[PDB]
Design a protein around this motif. Sequence first.
Motif, mmCIF file in Angstrom:
data_model
loop_
_atom_site.group_PDB
_atom_site.id
_atom_site.type_symbol
_atom_site.label_atom_id
_atom_site.label_comp_id
_atom_site.label_asym_id
_atom_site.label_seq_id
_atom_site.Cartn_x
_atom_site.Cartn_y
_atom_site.Cartn_z
ATOM 1 N N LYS A 69 0.821 -1.230 0.000
ATOM 2 C CA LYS A 69 0.000 0.000 0.000
ATOM 3 C C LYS A 69 0.847 1.270 0.000
ATOM 4 C CE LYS A 69 -3.627 0.185 2.735
ATOM 5 N NZ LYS A 69 -4.264 -0.169 4.009
ATOM 6 N N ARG A 92 -6.798 -9.426 -0.446
ATOM 7 C CA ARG A 92 -6.203 -8.157 -0.636
ATOM 8 C C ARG A 92 -5.015 -8.220 -1.581
ATOM 9 N NH1 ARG A 92 -5.968 -2.799 -1.339
ATOM 10 N NH2 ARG A 92 -6.035 -1.506 0.557
ATOM 11 N N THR A 105 -14.079 -1.506 -12.544
ATOM 12 C CA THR A 105 -14.067 -1.262 -11.146
ATOM 13 C C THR A 105 -13.340 -2.292 -10.334
ATOM 14 O OG1 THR A 105 -16.312 -2.118 -10.626
ATOM 15 C CG2 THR A 105 -16.184 0.189 -11.210
ATOM 16 N N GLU A 125 -10.703 -3.630 -11.080
ATOM 17 C CA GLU A 125 -9.301 -3.311 -11.134
ATOM 18 C C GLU A 125 -8.976 -1.855 -10.670
ATOM 19 O OE1 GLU A 125 -7.523 -3.648 -15.095
ATOM 20 O OE2 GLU A 125 -9.300 -2.818 -16.101
ATOM 21 N N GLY A 126 -9.952 -1.188 -10.083
ATOM 22 C CA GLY A 126 -9.728 0.206 -9.599
ATOM 23 C C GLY A 126 -9.826 1.262 -10.657
ATOM 24 N N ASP A 127 -10.404 0.931 -11.811
ATOM 25 C CA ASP A 127 -10.709 1.926 -12.810
ATOM 26 C C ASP A 127 -12.150 2.376 -12.609
ATOM 27 O OD1 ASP A 127 -11.158 3.550 -14.943
ATOM 28 O OD2 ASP A 127 -10.790 1.984 -16.487
ATOM 29 N N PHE A 128 -12.286 3.575 -12.023
ATOM 30 C CA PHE A 128 -13.602 4.137 -11.723
ATOM 31 C C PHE A 128 -13.989 5.226 -12.721
ATOM 32 C CE2 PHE A 128 -11.512 2.844 -7.761
ATOM 33 C CZ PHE A 128 -12.339 1.792 -7.431
ATOM 34 N N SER A 129 -13.350 5.231 -13.866
ATOM 35 C CA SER A 129 -13.632 6.178 -14.931
ATOM 36 C C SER A 129 -14.792 5.681 -15.781
ATOM 37 C CB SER A 129 -12.388 6.403 -15.771
ATOM 38 O OG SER A 129 -12.133 5.378 -16.706
ATOM 39 N N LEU A 130 -15.569 6.625 -16.295
ATOM 40 C CA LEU A 130 -16.876 6.332 -16.888
ATOM 41 C C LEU A 130 -16.937 6.523 -18.396
ATOM 42 C CD1 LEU A 130 -19.378 7.831 -14.278
ATOM 43 C CD2 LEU A 130 -18.527 5.496 -14.476
ATOM 44 N N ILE A 183 -12.491 8.806 -4.773
ATOM 45 C CA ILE A 183 -12.142 7.485 -5.350
ATOM 46 C C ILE A 183 -12.670 7.382 -6.770
ATOM 47 C CG2 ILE A 183 -12.353 4.956 -5.158
ATOM 48 C CD1 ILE A 183 -11.058 5.988 -2.692
ATOM 49 N N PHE A 184 -13.961 7.625 -6.909
ATOM 50 C CA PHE A 184 -14.638 7.484 -8.141
ATOM 51 C C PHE A 184 -14.280 8.542 -9.184
ATOM 52 C CE2 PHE A 184 -18.730 5.118 -6.493
ATOM 53 C CZ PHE A 184 -17.996 4.024 -6.129
ATOM 54 N N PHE A 185 -14.719 8.269 -10.402
ATOM 55 C CA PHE A 185 -14.590 9.134 -11.549
ATOM 56 C C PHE A 185 -13.189 9.293 -12.030
ATOM 57 C CE2 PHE A 185 -17.746 10.772 -8.488
ATOM 58 C CZ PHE A 185 -18.861 10.301 -9.144
ATOM 59 N N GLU A 186 -12.310 8.399 -11.647
ATOM 60 C CA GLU A 186 -10.929 8.446 -12.047
ATOM 61 C C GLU A 186 -10.446 7.017 -12.289
ATOM 62 O OE1 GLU A 186 -9.384 11.486 -11.488
ATOM 63 O OE2 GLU A 186 -7.255 11.102 -10.979
ATOM 64 N N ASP A 187 -9.534 6.832 -13.200
ATOM 65 C CA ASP A 187 -8.879 5.564 -13.383
ATOM 66 C C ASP A 187 -7.746 5.461 -12.439
ATOM 67 O OD1 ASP A 187 -7.497 3.254 -14.109
ATOM 68 O OD2 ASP A 187 -7.199 3.929 -16.138
ATOM 69 N N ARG A 188 -7.961 4.701 -11.362
ATOM 70 C CA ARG A 188 -6.913 4.457 -10.363
ATOM 71 C C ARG A 188 -6.265 3.084 -10.481
ATOM 72 N NH1 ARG A 188 -7.236 8.829 -7.104
ATOM 73 N NH2 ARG A 188 -9.211 9.978 -7.204
ATOM 74 N N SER A 189 -6.238 2.530 -11.676
ATOM 75 C CA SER A 189 -5.922 1.090 -11.778
ATOM 76 C C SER A 189 -4.412 0.879 -11.758
ATOM 77 C CB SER A 189 -6.545 0.540 -13.045
ATOM 78 O OG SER A 189 -6.013 1.207 -14.153
ATOM 79 N N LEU A 242 -4.929 0.274 -4.360
ATOM 80 C CA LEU A 242 -6.066 0.936 -3.790
ATOM 81 C C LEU A 242 -5.824 1.036 -2.316
ATOM 82 C CD1 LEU A 242 -9.690 -0.374 -4.435
ATOM 83 C CD2 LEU A 242 -8.858 1.953 -4.909
ATOM 84 N N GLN A 243 -5.979 2.254 -1.766
ATOM 85 C CA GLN A 243 -5.701 2.495 -0.346
ATOM 86 C C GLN A 243 -6.786 1.965 0.554
ATOM 87 O OE1 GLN A 243 -2.838 3.456 1.025
ATOM 88 N NE2 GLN A 243 -2.021 3.415 -1.025
ATOM 89 N N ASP A 244 -8.026 2.056 0.118
ATOM 90 C CA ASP A 244 -9.170 1.688 0.935
ATOM 91 C C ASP A 244 -9.365 0.189 1.076
ATOM 92 O OD1 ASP A 244 -11.773 1.262 1.899
ATOM 93 O OD2 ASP A 244 -12.514 3.110 0.957
ATOM 94 N N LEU A 272 -13.328 -1.054 0.493
ATOM 95 C CA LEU A 272 -13.663 -1.096 -0.905
ATOM 96 C C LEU A 272 -12.880 -2.174 -1.632
ATOM 97 C CD1 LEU A 272 -15.273 0.133 -3.201
ATOM 98 C CD2 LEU A 272 -13.449 1.725 -3.626
ATOM 99 N N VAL A 300 -19.911 -3.236 -8.391
ATOM 100 C CA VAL A 300 -19.797 -1.810 -8.054
ATOM 101 C C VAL A 300 -19.659 -1.064 -9.352
ATOM 102 C CG1 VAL A 300 -18.443 0.031 -6.969
ATOM 103 C CG2 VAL A 300 -18.646 -2.283 -5.918
ATOM 104 N N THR A 301 -20.570 -0.070 -9.554
ATOM 105 C CA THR A 301 -20.443 0.897 -10.595
ATOM 106 C C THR A 301 -20.143 2.261 -9.951
ATOM 107 O OG1 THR A 301 -22.886 1.083 -10.757
ATOM 108 C CG2 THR A 301 -21.844 -0.421 -12.324
ATOM 109 N N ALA A 302 -19.399 3.094 -10.683
ATOM 110 C CA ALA A 302 -18.749 4.252 -10.086
ATOM 111 C C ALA A 302 -19.609 5.511 -10.223
ATOM 112 C CB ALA A 302 -17.325 4.417 -10.615
ATOM 113 N N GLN A 333 -22.681 5.720 -11.641
ATOM 114 C CA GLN A 333 -23.003 5.626 -13.039
ATOM 115 C C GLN A 333 -24.501 5.646 -13.285
ATOM 116 O OE1 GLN A 333 -20.944 2.110 -14.870
ATOM 117 N NE2 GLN A 333 -22.523 2.240 -16.455
#
Lengths: 329, 328, 328, 329
Positions: B249, B284, C128, C130-135, D266-272, D276-278, D281, D292-294, D296
């Motif tokens: 992390k 995790r 999501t 994979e942590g991609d929360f882009s729409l 967290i949302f609305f961004e590509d954090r891949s 992930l810190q959380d 989630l 989970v949808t971001a 949407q």
Amino acid sequence: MRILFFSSQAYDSESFQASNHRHGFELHFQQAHLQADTAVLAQGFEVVCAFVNDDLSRPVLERLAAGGTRLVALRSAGYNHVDLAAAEALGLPVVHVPAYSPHAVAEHAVGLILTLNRRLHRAYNRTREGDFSLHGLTGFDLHGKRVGVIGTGQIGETFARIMAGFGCELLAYDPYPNPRIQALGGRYLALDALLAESDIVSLHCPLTADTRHLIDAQRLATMKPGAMLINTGRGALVNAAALIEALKSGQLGYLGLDVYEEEADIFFEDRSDQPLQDDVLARLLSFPNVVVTAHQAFLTREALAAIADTTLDNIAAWQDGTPRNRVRA
Amino acid sequence: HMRILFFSSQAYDSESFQASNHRHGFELHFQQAHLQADTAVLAQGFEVVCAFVNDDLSRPVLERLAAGGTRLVALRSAGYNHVDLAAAEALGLPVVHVPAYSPHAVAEHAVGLILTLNRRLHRAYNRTREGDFSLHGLTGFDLHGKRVGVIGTGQIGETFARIMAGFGCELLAYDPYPNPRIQALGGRYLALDALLAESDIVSLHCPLTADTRHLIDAQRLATMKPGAMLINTGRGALVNAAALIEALKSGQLGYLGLDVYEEEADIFFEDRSDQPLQDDVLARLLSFPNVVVTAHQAFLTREALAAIADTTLDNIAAWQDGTPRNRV
Amino acid sequence: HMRILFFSSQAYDSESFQASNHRHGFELHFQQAHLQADTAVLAQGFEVVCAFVNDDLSRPVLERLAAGGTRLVALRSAGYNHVDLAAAEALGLPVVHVPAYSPHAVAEHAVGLILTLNRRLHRAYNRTREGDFSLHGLTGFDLHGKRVGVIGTGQIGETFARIMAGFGCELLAYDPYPNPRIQALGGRYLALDALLAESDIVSLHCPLTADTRHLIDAQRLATMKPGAMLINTGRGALVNAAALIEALKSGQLGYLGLDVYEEEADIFFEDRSDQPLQDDVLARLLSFPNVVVTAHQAFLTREALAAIADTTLDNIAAWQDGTPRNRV
Amino acid sequence: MRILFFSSQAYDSESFQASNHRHGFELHFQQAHLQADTAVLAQGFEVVCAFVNDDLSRPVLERLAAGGTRLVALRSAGYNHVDLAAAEALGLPVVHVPAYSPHAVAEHAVGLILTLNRRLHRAYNRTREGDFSLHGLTGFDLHGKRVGVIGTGQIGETFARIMAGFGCELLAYDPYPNPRIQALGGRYLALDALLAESDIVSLHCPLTADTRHLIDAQRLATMKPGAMLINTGRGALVNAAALIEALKSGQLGYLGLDVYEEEADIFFEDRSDQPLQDDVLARLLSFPNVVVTAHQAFLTREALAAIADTTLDNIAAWQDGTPRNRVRA
């Protein structure tokens, strides 16, 4: 001295900023592609830095020249996208990177071999989802296998030395054999015998009229049944269409591509929102025993640093009137 | 006439053991089901049972096999944590195994894990398959020139070291009993903590013992070079998995490749994808972008499987001739 | 005493048939393997064999079952393309089946395919996770107000129509024999070609016959509204899959949801992921971003499976009482 | 009248351009997030249009005001990211979208139900790769099941009517019951009885001090074993941490989230590309029976058109001095 970069990625800005510590150029990074309707952004910029997916056809060059651009620097080796006859006519010189880092590229080839062999891309997707079952993931030891290197230039040689360290038996084909391949334990032989004998074939020869479609349906049918083919060289070394039937029949066991003949129109962009137009590529992408990377073989920090250093040096050289890595029609 | 019942059978078991049987002619029976109290009855009348590490060989199961006429338990594995050995000895039911896996298969797997993590090949594949040919985030590093620390320079560690030397890596090593072959490769021995601080990539290959248990714990992870890659193809209990989380992390640990996991015999070798994964730590780890886990797949080559089958059938033939081999 | 051997058994078969057996007490045997020439021997001594659509019931297999004492073939399916019926009749080996699947299970599946394609839920999930929360690219359309064309207003088509009416869709319908229930929902009947030109979403529910074979062919696809969604949960041969490709490539067909595919009995119901897919057309369809294929899963609910089991065991009891039901 | 949009997506430009056909504002779309070091981009712009992931804390507001920005228009309903006390102090008014399209949001909830029920996200991933096997994909008929609607405002009512069309038996809880729910065939009952009786529970109540963490470990343990929970309402309606143990035990059978309590970060961004810190989630995302949808649920063309029309109307209204959808401290 001001430089406008089109098709900019974060890895471009990061590498070129670091490389600029010995130049002090003024760097501008535009994400948009260069094309007829974005050329206007380069107005007043003396140097434009383009990648292979940028449009440098005559109409675009004319607009850059009229807008006062005096040099096109390609942060690539390839330049298919450039109308060179038009650039010469317009008095707009073109420079490029002569060759990519051989360690980066040969390492990537070996990574494609191991992922395919051990099905690591398939394993990842299973375990990520709690599937720890191993059916269909059995590979083969590289130790003792015959590895055929087609083209024993710098990258091919570097690849050969790595594969020799796994204890592979090295086979090689090059119009101009060298003794270094021999010192690794490599045996030169005829192309056709390389293809029939090799468990793994890796392409590293230059693309020319003679090597265009070197691996075509005939060459595929010469290969050992179930063999692995790796192409990190240039897309046109292979006739992708012929790979399909060979993969369907099992004649070709595995395929690793980092290049593809239609690539400058396809690669380096996220096209996932739309149907893929190319039937051949779409079909290749489906097979469980094919991995395609999108001309990623030079995508290491060190190799990107070399591209940035080379490109900024090319620009300093043009400035001083020294012909360095110019591309001429 | 030898009859052998295999539990927890895979197609790759059947293929390899059929080929090895060319010089034995044993009657081979392949049952997919796991061995456990309520499937032991399937071994009724079989004098040899061939088991893998996820099969249940606790006392109740052994005692049922013995009553049903089973006289030898042959493990097609090096590990045997699932076997109550005391109970087997008490019952006079000998237990044989494979001493070691193919060093080339296992070391090559470790190098594959390296390359896939470095070049993000697993991530790339999943992009390109869907028509995403964009390269953001996939930038790796040349292996040439990097420091690679080998912990344990037995047969597998040595084989791994030779391969990495051929990439032009600078080799560091730690072993209580250093050897000259590592030296001849260009390798330098040094203290474990110094290896960890200097290495860009660290790979575990030492035997698990009371001394190496949790060798990589939170303190050792903090001693490592920030951003470094760790590979564990050795044994799950070499690492304290729970400590790996916070290190991942924070970015202190840049990459992780695991082929083994502590208590994997309860988790691995089954498709558990239909159900929640109970293990919070493994769940995790699985979802980080810079972690690849394979399910004890490092010996999963045709040649390594052939060695396991050849050894196991030779262990069975040796027991049959009254001169047992590779008993535990 | 009835003994029944099931081939191509899944855990969901065993669960549903065990529950249905509460009022029969038949002896149920569940074999995972497919029925074919070389596994027919497993049915030796079983008077009833229970088969699914992917099992091989060609003459050689039937003739072996009959010789082995099998007296009834019970299909836990509506379809029976894999059965040589002439050869079974010649052998006096009756064949029974399930007449129809649960209309709520199948229509709800069709609506699920709609929603997943519209809202790109399959694509979203894979981001999501994979942590991609882009729409980007995930924008859909309200169903409310849209024109939904139902082709075939039998039981499933009607059920589908009611559901879509509850979303506030405008319902269009085509059936050679219209019914008033569709009308009561607010549905309008019209010519097939007019339905296709007007509809934002078209869903197939008509029986397959010589007249409806390739009902959706290249010409009908061109008649559809550019960008429209097509759903086929009816029967594979209702559509000319090969024509769907060019329509998808051009954008003429905006979305496709399939639960069925022509000759699916050769492809579906097996994990074929380890091998190249030979079918070029299906392989192409699978990789479009706006196509979802499920593997004839539309009747795969607990309640629909219970109906299939109840019907099949009642078919077997009826044959046993000398008064057969649902013979083909 | 000039409007600068921060955190701009292609779907923002497309919807706002179409909506601008009855305003003629000058629209500028910046992809970058609003924060202390990008506020300078809004210099000289009278109106800035922000989304929930933009930083509108005091330091950013001060900079916008000093730079001559006179209105902050949020193209969102939510405004947690805004320091309203600071905006008032600075004389910088804030407007927003009062509510999202109820059809878009209720439809999305139903889509989450069906994907979870029929495991469509899992099926897709199998068939894409040639896995046509059906193990573990068995669902349940919606027909006849009890569906509990918590909050029978506009979205809850819309959701209820759709689920009634599947032939579900509708249960409802609202402090202020309405007769429309009744006309659909819906039965009002106590919250606790709704939770114990329902096969599917869907949250559509406003977030307030009373509904914060409405679904907490106690409420989860009230639910029917194996039930499905859907939250398209607001993240804080649920204690996400308590969902984990319920999913692990099987007490909660399924979970569909379109919102999450930490979401604007967290949302609305590509954090891949990054861990992930959380922890919570990350754990939710792993389960095979969670989708989970971001956020949407309003992401349809029509619903985006409503947001654009509303936001441009809010801006025209501010211009004329009409208090329309102002947010006040």
